[PDB]
Each structure stands twice: as C-alpha cells, then as structure tokens.
C-alpha cells in the first residue's frame, strides 16, 4: 500500500528503519490511517515524548502529504477513536494490546504499565 511512501519518507530522513518495520509488523495489512498512526507513534515514542495528541497527528502534515494519505478510505473518517477501536490490534487497554488510548493520547503498552504502577505506588 503506502510502503513506498514510508520508504521515501525514510529517504527524506525523518523516519527510521526500526519505526517503519515496527509499524509494518504491528499493523500487517491494516488501514492507511492505522499504519500512519502506528508509524508516528513509534517515531514520537523514540524521540522521548510520551504524549501524543490526536489533533497533532491529524493536523501535522509534516513527514508526508498526510491529507492525501488519510484520504484513502470512504470520505474522511475523522472519528479516530472509532477507526482505532475498529482495528483488532487496538483496544481501550483491557485487552493485552501494544497500543493504549487512555487520556485522549495514544502511547505504548510498556509506558502505560510504568505510569500505572508509579501512580499506584504514589497513592
């Protein structure tokens, strides 16, 4: 699908081979929105910041022409919560999934476990 777009984005030197291979592996043959969300999640988790607002991932348009990228399904499915829950690889956090959405931000399962344990130890 968009693998050549991810490869030329890597050639433009803002995504890493680890990030693109991780996104490809964790998504398989999922939707373009889900693949780009996973790739940006991997990149922004690799830069250090745990926060990841949906508004930023829907309005950044930085690493790619993301408007034309996200126009790949019927219309423009702006309900990112529904399109993220629709994928089998993502749940709200009860199921053992790598992608966790808890505080209107999407971040990795390991960071979620670390934050939950440190919160329970704080209280």
């Amino acid at each position: 699908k968009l693998q050549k777009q991810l490869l030329e984005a890597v050639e433009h030197k803002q995504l890493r081979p680890l990030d693109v291979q991780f996104a490809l592996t964790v998504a398989g043959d999922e939707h373009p929105a889900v693949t780009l969300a996973a790739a940006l999640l991997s990149h922004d988790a690799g830069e250090g910041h745990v926060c990841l607002p949906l508004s930023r991932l829907e309005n950044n348009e930085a690493s790619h022409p993301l408007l034309a990228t996200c126009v790949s399904e019927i219309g423009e499915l702006q309900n990112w919560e529904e399109c993220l829950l629709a994928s089998q690889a993502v749940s709200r956090g009860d199921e053992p999934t790598p992608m966790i959405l808890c505080g209107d931000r999407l971040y990795l399962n390991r960071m979620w476990c670390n934050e939950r344990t440190v919160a329970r130890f704080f209280n």
């Binding site: 890493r16 291979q21 991780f22 964790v26 690889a89 053992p96 999934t97 790598p98 399962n109």
Partner: protein, 747 residues
C-alpha cells in the same frame, strides 16, 4: 642439486634458506633474477605466503605471486555469487549472519561488531531456525507450521519491544524481553535487510529474456553493496563479464527465455578462467607456474613439486573428438607441451639449478617416487660423470656413489639439531635455536598453596554455591576462571526431543515452573506460544506424561505440605557473621522439593539448612521430596552438635578456598552406603568387602558403557589425565579424612 624432502611446508622452508645462502655467497645477485616454477600455484600459495610474511626484518626479501585464479577480493566475489544463489536457498541463520560478517555488507546498513555481538545472542535465544516465510516453507513441500521462522522471530522481537513479556500472548506469540531499551535500531536494520532480501528473492524467480536480464546485475550491486576505494575494481570486472556474456548472447540472435541457474553457473565458471600476471617482472622474486610459449633467460631456476602423478599435468580428450584417432604433424597436446616445457626450463637456466620433490611421506614414513623426467635426468647425470676418488672401481658402483652424493635428504622436523650443526646445510632461523639446543625448563604443577584468610562475613548463598561443587567453585570463585565452552551454534532443526543437557536445563525450567499447582492449560498455552515444545501431538504427549508424573509427586507433596513462612538468619560463629534468607521454613520442620533425582548433594544442602536452622532455633525433621520414592530423613539435634558441625564446615570452607579440596560426594556417598552401616558403626576391614566397596566407588566414579560417570569431567581432566593407583589411594584417604564430616553426618 637435488633435495628430497617430506612436506610442502618443509620444502618452502628449505628453499628460503637456500635462496638466502646463495644471495649471501654471491656478491652480484638480485632478487629480480630468481624464479620459482611451481607445478600448481593454488596448492602452494598459502605456505609460501605464510613463510615469506613470517620472515623477520633482518632476514626479509620481497616476493610476488603470479598466475593465480582471477579472484582476489574473495569475500566480495563469493558473497555476490551467493547473492545470485538466492531462490534455491533455505535461509539458515548461520548463512544469513555469514552475509552480515562481510565488512562491506555490514557497513552498507551502518552496523558494526558492537551490534553484531548483540544480534548473535538475539537470534540464538529468540528461536529463529527455519526459513523466511510460509511461502518458502510451502515451496519445499513441507507442512507450514508457521513457527520458528524469520517472520516469527522478527514479530516476536518487535512485539517484545512494544510490550513486556509478563503480559502473556496477544496474537499467539509470546513477546520477547531483552530488546526493550535504546538498542532496537539494530533489530530495525536487520528487519529492513530481511525485507530487501525478500523483495529481491521474489523478483529473481521468473524467467526473463536477455533484454530484461541486462540491468539486473548493476541493480543488485547498487542495491546491496557499497562502493569503496578497492571494491570498485571487482565490481567493474563483474559488470564487464556480465555485459560481455549477455551481449554475445544478444548478438547471436537468441529468442527464447533462459533460467537464472544457467547464467549464474556460467558467470561462476568464466570468473575462474582469467589470471592476474601484472606483478611478474616488478622486481621481487618471481613466483609463477609453468606456462607454455614463455622462455625468458634467468640466472637461477628453481622447480618445486616434481612428484609422480602431479607433473606432467593430464587432460583427457573428449572421446567424440576426431583428431585423436588420426594424428598429424600440427597437433598439440598437453603432455608433450609440458614435456617440452621441461626442456626449455633446463636450457634457459644459465648459472644454477634447484630441483625438489617429496620423497618420503610424513604420516607413516613410507616411500614415494619422483617424476620420470627427473629420474631420466638423474640417470644421465650418473651415467655421464664419475667422482675423482674412485678413478677405476666400477661403472655401477661409481653411478651409485654419484647419485648418492648429489641427493641431499633433508630432516623431518625444524628443531632437529642436524639443521643447526655447523657445516654446509646450516639454517638461518633463530626462533628454533633454544628448542633445538635443549635449553628449557619443564612445566610445574598447576595447584599450589595459596594464602587465603577468612573474612568476618561470609553470606549463606556463597557457602551454598561453594558446597554445591567444591572443586568447580574453587576454580570459578577464588581465581575467577571458568572453562566456559564454545557458544551453542543455532541448530538447523526445531526441537523434536528433550534429552541430555537439553533435558536437564530446559526440563528443569519447565518442571520448576510447573510445580506451582495452579491452572495447567494456561501455562501449557504460554509455553507453546513461546515456541519450545514439539509440534502438536508429540508436545501434547510429552506434556501429558509430565503432568501424570508430577501430579503423582504433588499428591505426596500436598499430603503434608502445611504452608509455613520465610525467616532471616543472623549469627556469629567463629567470629564470622553468616547472613542469609530462608526459603520454605515452617514450625513442622524441613520439608522441601526439587524436581530431580535423589542425590547426596541435595541431602547435604538440606543438612546445611537444618544445621543453620538448629543453630538459630530449629526443632523438626529434615525431608526433601524427590522423584522415584524420594526421601530424606534425620531427627533434629542439639545446639552443641549444631555449632560444632557448623564450625567444622566453616573450617572446611576456609581450607577449600586456599587448597583444592577433594570432595566427590556421590561416589563418596556410594562408598558411605557400602562401608559404614547403621547397624555396626565401624568400617569393614575384610579385603573382599573393601574391594567390593572399591568396585562400587569406581562404578560411581566412572560409569559403564550405558551411563556416564562423575569423574569424566573437564575439571578432573584438567587436574589429571588418568587415575593412577597412587592418586586413587590418595582420593580414598582424603575421602576418609575430609569427607569424614559427610561420612558421620549422613548415614
């Protein structure tokens, strides 16, 4: 001259000294004027290269090998051929890492040895054994298991990067644990390379015409390799050969389609026909083979390898050729070509000559023979001259004397004193002089009395790790050296069975996780998602027989397993503060379990635990549940005996750190059960009974053909080769002295 020698190594080592002697003796001679004509350079290049690179600074003369096969950048060239052998591969991890080990291919993806050392143990422990994909499995007509593959390993690694390994399976794959930090970029580079390999092996499948075969070599080289300051010449040569063969095929007007396996095996054969001969007369000593139509006059001509069956080189006619049955004048053959090359080599020499060959085998000191040409030359030399000593004795006797005088049988080994004796055949080497003059000292004994003092705090875990195996703990504790073997190479097969060392380690882990009496189906599913058990029915059978054994054991475990507590020991014995924690301590006594066979080492660990418990409180029996009706038993004792025996064990520890304490508990346990009984409290003194006890001790030490013995071990092999009567008597007496603790303590 003629020089009968033993091995090619010794031939070249003799030739070096003879060349040096000639150069030193003649004041007007140049290394430009010396030639060495080996019969085949492929079998003599490594020895010549080794000795002429190992010649020291004050003894060095330059050299240059010519007429080799046309491969100098061997890693690049054979790596490229192996790249062209993609669609027939099976993709084992050792082969894939062998492609990584090439420095150019490693530096293309910007990964070094500091990452390669991580990826070795990553692919070893992640479970990556079989091919790349389910399509690759199915094209070999095998059941597509979908486990233990490259896709499986990469999915496991990335899932373990995303999620911790304690969260269980998500898509029937257990996540890995180590690849979590800032090191996953190496995994990403490996995954990108694997994706590139998959794309190119998908693209290399179908047949193409020549017009489509034109750019694939350049595309492959640019996509995979990386140009450097030296590899570009090899890349240009490869491109030239590929272009030449395909251009000739195109110009010959071929219209059909051809498979890849034809062009690959044609390029790999046209590569091995060219030669390199641009270092011939550069100035160093000229090393080259025997080539026709080249007769340059030199000063010293040396011929090596004149064995029977090696020269003249042979080549058979094709059979359906027609020029063989009807010869004429102009016909040319390899046999007479080499036979005339010998005459040209004899004529072209102007000052000296030097012919050498193997005359005696080095393996069994048998007899060998020279070539017919050398035999005829020696015969004519003997029949044309006579020594001045015997002016008129006999023709045949004079011939024998001359042929014995000319031949010089060299020695068999470098450090023979005949080489360094003063005379004519003296050597120029000096590194073998003290080894040939017998001016060395013999080896000492490894074990020595080392002064060790006892600190004021030894932890309980250190004592347990010492008394698990005293000799091995002395090796890897006092002087910190272990004889760790080579790392286990990644097997080419999935785990079919569980036997031997695999049984020990893996089954120990599996049973020790299986003990805990919780739900077994979830644990079985987790271990099969981890990819360890065999495929399907065999794994189910193995799990079922382990379950029906371990439930039987757990029945008698739970039949008296009252849940206890875990306490902490602090105590002062001999001015030493022994500290440690206690697992499975209860008011009832000592009831333990370890899923293995019955052993006096296990009983002695339980004994130590019982003594430290009795030293700090501790009333109750000592049991430790084992397989095959496992049982240990002794009533609790008093604090006087507890402290006395604890002090005795601490003294034994402080002696075993200083000196290699000989304790072999299991064989000592067998001799304990044989000699000392619970009914007599005195050892037997009859010769037959003591020899029977010795028989039980020696069968416990070394086993029969069926089972392996305790004494067969790397540590005991390091201590001594064999068991002489003196040292086995010493072992029995040292048992009777220092194992006498265990002799009294365990009955």
């Amino acid at each position: 001259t003629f020089h009968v020698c033993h091995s090619p190594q010794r031939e070249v080592e003799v030739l070096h000294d003879r060349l040096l002697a000639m150069l030193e003796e003649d004041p007007t001679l140049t290394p430009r004027d010396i030639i060495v004509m080996v019969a085949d350079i492929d079998s003599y290049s490594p020895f010549i290269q080794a000795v002429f690179g190992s010649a020291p600074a004050d003894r060095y003369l330059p050299y240059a090998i010519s007429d080799r096969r046309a491969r100098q950048s061997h890693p690049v060239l054979e790596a490229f051929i192996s790249l062209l052998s993609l669609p027939d591969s099976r993709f084992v991890s050792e082969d894939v890492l062998a492609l990584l080990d090439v420095p150019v291919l490693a530096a293309r993806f910007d990964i070094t040895e500091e990452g390669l050392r991580y990826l070795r143990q990553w692919v070893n422990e992640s479970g990556i054994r079989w091919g790349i994909d389910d399509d690759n499995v199915r094209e070999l007509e095998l059941p597509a298991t979908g486990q233990h593959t490259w896709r499986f390993g990469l999915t496991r690694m990335l899932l373990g990067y995303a999620m911790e390994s304690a969260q269980g399976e998500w898509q029937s794959v257990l996540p890995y644990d180590e690849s979590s930090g800032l090191i996953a970029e190496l995994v990403g580079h490996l995954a990108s390379l694997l994706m590139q390999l998959n794309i190119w092996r998908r693209g290399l499948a179908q047949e193409r015409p020549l017009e489509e075969w034109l750019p694939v070599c350049r595309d492959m080289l640019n996509a995979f390799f990386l140009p450097d300051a030296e590899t570009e010449a090899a890349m240009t040569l490869i491109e030239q050969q590929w272009q030449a063969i395909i251009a000739e095929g195109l110009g010959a007007q071929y219209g059909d389609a051809v498979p890849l396996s034809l062009l690959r095996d044609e390029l790999a054969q046209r590569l091995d026909q060219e030669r390199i001969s641009q270092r011939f007369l550069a100035g160093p000593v000229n090393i080259c083979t025997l080539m026709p139509m080249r007769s340059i006059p030199f000063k010293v001509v040396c011929l090596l390898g004149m064995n029977d069956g090696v020269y003249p080189r042979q080549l058979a006619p094709l059979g359906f050729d027609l020029m063989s049955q009807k010869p004429k004048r102009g016909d040319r053959s390899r046999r007479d070509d080499d036979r005339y090359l010998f005459l040209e080599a004899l004529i072209s020499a102007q000052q000296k000559l030097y012919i050498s060959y193997i005359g005696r085998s080095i393996q069994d000191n048998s007899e060998r023979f020279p070539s017919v040409l050398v035999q005829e030359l020696i015969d004519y030399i003997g029949q044309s001259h006579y020594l001045p000593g015997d002016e008129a004795l006999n023709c045949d006797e004079s011939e024998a004397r001359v042929k014995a005088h000319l031949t010089c049988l060299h020695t068999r080994m470098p450090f023979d004193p005949q080489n360094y004796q003063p005379g004519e055949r003296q050597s120029y080497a000096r590194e073998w002089l003290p080894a040939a003059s017998q001016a060395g000292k013999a080896h000492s004994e490894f074990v020595q009395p080392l002064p060790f003092t006892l600190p004021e705090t030894v932890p309980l875990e250190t004592l347990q790790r010492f008394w698990a195996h005293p000799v091995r703990a002395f090796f890897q504790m006092r002087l910190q050296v272990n004889f760790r073997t080579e790392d286990s190479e990644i097997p080419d097969t999935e785990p079919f069975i569980l036997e031997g060392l695999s049984r020990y380690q893996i089954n120990q882990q599996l049973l020790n996780a299986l003990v805990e009496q919780d739900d077994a189906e979830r644990l079985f599913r987790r271990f099969r998602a981890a990819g360890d058990l065999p495929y399907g029915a065999f794994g189910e059978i193995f799990w079922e027989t382990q379950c029906q054994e371990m439930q039987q054991l757990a029945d008698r475990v739970i039949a008296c397993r009252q849940p206890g507590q875990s306490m902490e020991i602090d105590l002062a014995c001999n001015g030493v503060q022994i500290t440690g924690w206690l697992p499975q301590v209860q008011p009832d006594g000592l009831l333990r379990w370890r899923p293995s066979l019955l052993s006096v080492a296990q009983g002695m660990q339980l004994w130590l635990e019982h003594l430290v418990y009795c030293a700090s409180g501790g009333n109750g029996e000592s049991r430790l549940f084992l397989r095959k009706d496992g049982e240990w038993r002794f009533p609790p004792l008093a604090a006087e005996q507890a402290l006395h025996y604890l002090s005795q064990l601490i003294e034994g520890y402080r002696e075993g750190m200083s000196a290699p304490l000989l304790v072999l508990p299991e064989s000592g346990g067998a001799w304990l059960k044989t000699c000392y009984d619970a009914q007599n409290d005195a050892m037997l003194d009859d010769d037959s009974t003591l020899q029977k006890a010795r028989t039980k001790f020696l069968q416990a030490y070394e086993g029969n053909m069926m089972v392996r013995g305790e004494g067969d071990d790397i540590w005991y092999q390091r201590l001594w080769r064999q068991l002489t009567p003196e040292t086995m008597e010493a072992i029995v007496e040292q048992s009777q002295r220092f194992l006498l603790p265990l002799f009294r303590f365990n009955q």
